[PDB]
Amino acid sequence: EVQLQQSGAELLKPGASVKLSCIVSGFKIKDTSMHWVKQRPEQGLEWIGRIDPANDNSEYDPKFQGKATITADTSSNTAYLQLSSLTSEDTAVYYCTLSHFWGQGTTLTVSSAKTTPPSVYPLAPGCGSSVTLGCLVKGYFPESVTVTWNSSVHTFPALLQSGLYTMSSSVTVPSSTWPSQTVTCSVAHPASSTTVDKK
Amino acid sequence: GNPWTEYMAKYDIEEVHGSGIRVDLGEDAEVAGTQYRLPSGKCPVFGKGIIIENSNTTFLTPVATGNQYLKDGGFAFPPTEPLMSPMTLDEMRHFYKDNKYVKNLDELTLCSRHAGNMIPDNDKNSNYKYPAVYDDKDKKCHILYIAAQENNGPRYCNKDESKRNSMFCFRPAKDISFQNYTYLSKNVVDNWEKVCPRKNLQNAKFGLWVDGNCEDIPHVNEFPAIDLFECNKLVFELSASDQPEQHLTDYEKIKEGFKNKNASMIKYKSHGKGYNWGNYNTETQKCEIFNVKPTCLINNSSYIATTALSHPIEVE
Amino acid sequence: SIVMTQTPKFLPVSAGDRVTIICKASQSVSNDVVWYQQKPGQSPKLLIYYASIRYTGVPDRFTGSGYGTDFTFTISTVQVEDLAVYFCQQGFSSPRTFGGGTKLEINRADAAPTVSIFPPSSEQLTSGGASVVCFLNNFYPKDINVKWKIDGSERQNGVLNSWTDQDSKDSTYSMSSTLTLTKDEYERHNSYTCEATHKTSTSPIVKSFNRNEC
């Protein structure tokens, strides 16, 4: 069985360099070009380049000459994208492709801001047939917060509240189900290894 | 002396194919510390497939995975993502589009090379490559997960309706429904068009070159055959076979070409020798089958010269 | 570099109507154009390759055609689940440039937002800050105005608005408006209100709370 496995989310300071990996399992990479494609938040796809793993010939868009370096390893069936002299314009999802088959992407965040866990603020009515509840997820970094309630959920995408991120999440339940039953938001932040539940 | 030498080269099946036809298991390759038998023939086998007995499920169906029972699956690679099998010709050409050599391969070698790109059971050091079946009708390459080709025993297999998870009874065959299939080992050569048999030879009868003349094959076994297809079938049935206890044990499974027991590891060679050739008399409807390599043609208008490797229908 | 000019950038369509997307190559790319679908949060998936060939598994509603410079992607009858951004790419010569993409929007009947205003929590209140959050949920179309009022007077400063992408089930939008104050400036005022102006009502949907009330 063929699988693509891209390395984890990266957070680095500007001026640094990163090496992203793309491990292909169950398939020999030698005959297939490994492409890397860039996608910046809310923007389109940009072809970075590709490597011929059989002959180590890699080519690029002239925009990425000096920035990107694509390598491949037919021994471990892995493709690599090294990015040098990191910049906020380098903040993007980076997709590897096994030819026309795409990986799940690797999120790169380039920022001088440090990994900061969020604080979780409950959003209750205070003082209709339905009621909406919420959770405020303020002052965290970098992106990737998973708030789970235990379908009628809305996740409002994060805004960069000066260096740090702020998101919010709402749930609507029958007004007979609350406050008679404990509704709980679980805010997950993998980067800082924090998961805190607000009642 | 002999005007037929280069013409006749592709019919030296021991030389050009070099493994079983009926059952091709002419190499062994290690996967995770065990030797497994696998197809190794250098020529495509046209019109070959696997008949699953007492069953409506066809062999190009993906093998049983997950909640599926053994008998509900066939022999082919299961549908995972990214999807490697079945892959159409155009999809394969697109997949290998930046490889000048592989992209320009004929569809049979392309299919064999694609299948040969699958890594078995996460063993990257393994020479084991899965065989494949190319269907020329729908232009699809089907990678075969099961490289076993015959399992036939009043003890080696169960034949029942209720027994859904017991072992397949199966055999290789040239069925009419397989007419557009080609069975492809990992070893299928680049130039099989030049060096391997494909079409049956009209107005031709295989003979032996003896003292400046093309003589009849000295030893021939003769069987009725209503048409060319039936003769090719019979010749295939008698052809080189790499096939081999009281029960179907793990070791007996390995010998039949089995590798896996429900997503886990299971823990001889003809070399192309066999009854690989037939002379078909179209007039008397007789199939004259023999086991020595032919070295010339007798030009007889009643005859079509056929091979176990040859297409069951196509003539030139 | 070959430029692939993809039009339109944004395509509102109703369930069951034709989606036509065009992609023009600045140089001749033969038949080597692929069309990708990117559903929100997902990797792009190949729909069409060599300009006109449907990939295995790809529904009949998806087609492409064209040779040379002019390429057409079509969804003959859009389904709600086709909501995605679609990208052409040329593969004929490197760099293998993508078109700019086309974002689908599923048209639906207009819906009024459901608005809930929330007071700052004690967890935030006794830390230095004070966020007043206001949800404008399940509305259509996307165009919505929110005016925040403190003690009656409109505040534009210190307000952060976040829209969701179109909901995959009901095709509506939702948005959160958060007025963030300090703990000192928040206790300096009383009546905090968010007013939703949407084309579903003549008058705004006002949701208020007095800090005195509790």
Author numbering:
A (entry chain H): 1 to 127, 132 to 154, 160 to 208
B (entry chain A): 107 to 350, 354 to 376, 390 to 438
C (entry chain L): 1 to 214
List passages from the publication reporting this PDB structure:
AMA1 domains I+II in complex with 1F9 Fab crystallized under identical conditions into two crystal forms: crystal form 1 and crystal form 2, which have been solved to 2.4 and 2.3 Å, respectively. An overview of crystal form 1, the more complete of the two crystal structures, is shown in Figure 1A. 1F9 interacts exclusively with domain I of AMA1. The total buried surface area at the 1F9–AMA1 interface is 2,470 Å2, with 1,250 Å2 buried on the AMA1 surface and 1,220 Å2 buried on the 1F9 surface. The structure of AMA1-1F9 crystal form 1 is the only AMA1 structure describing loop If. In addition, the region of loop II adjacent to the hydrophobic trough is visible, making this the first AMA1 structure that provides a complete view of the hydrophobic trough. In crystal form 1, three additional residues have been identified as components of the trough. The 12 hydrophobic residues are V169 and L176 on either side of loop Ib, F183 and M190 either side of loop Ic, Y202 and V208 within loop Id, M224 N-terminal to loop Ie, Y251 and I252 at the centre of the trough that extends from a loop following PAN beta strand 4 in domain I, M273 C-terminal side to loop If, and L357 and F367 within loop II. Loops Ic and Id have identical conformations in crystal forms 1 and 2, presumably because these loops form a major part of the AMA1-1F9 interface. In contrast, within loop Ie, residue 225 interacts with 1F9 in a consistent manner, whereas the remainder of the loop adopts a different conformation in the two crystal forms.
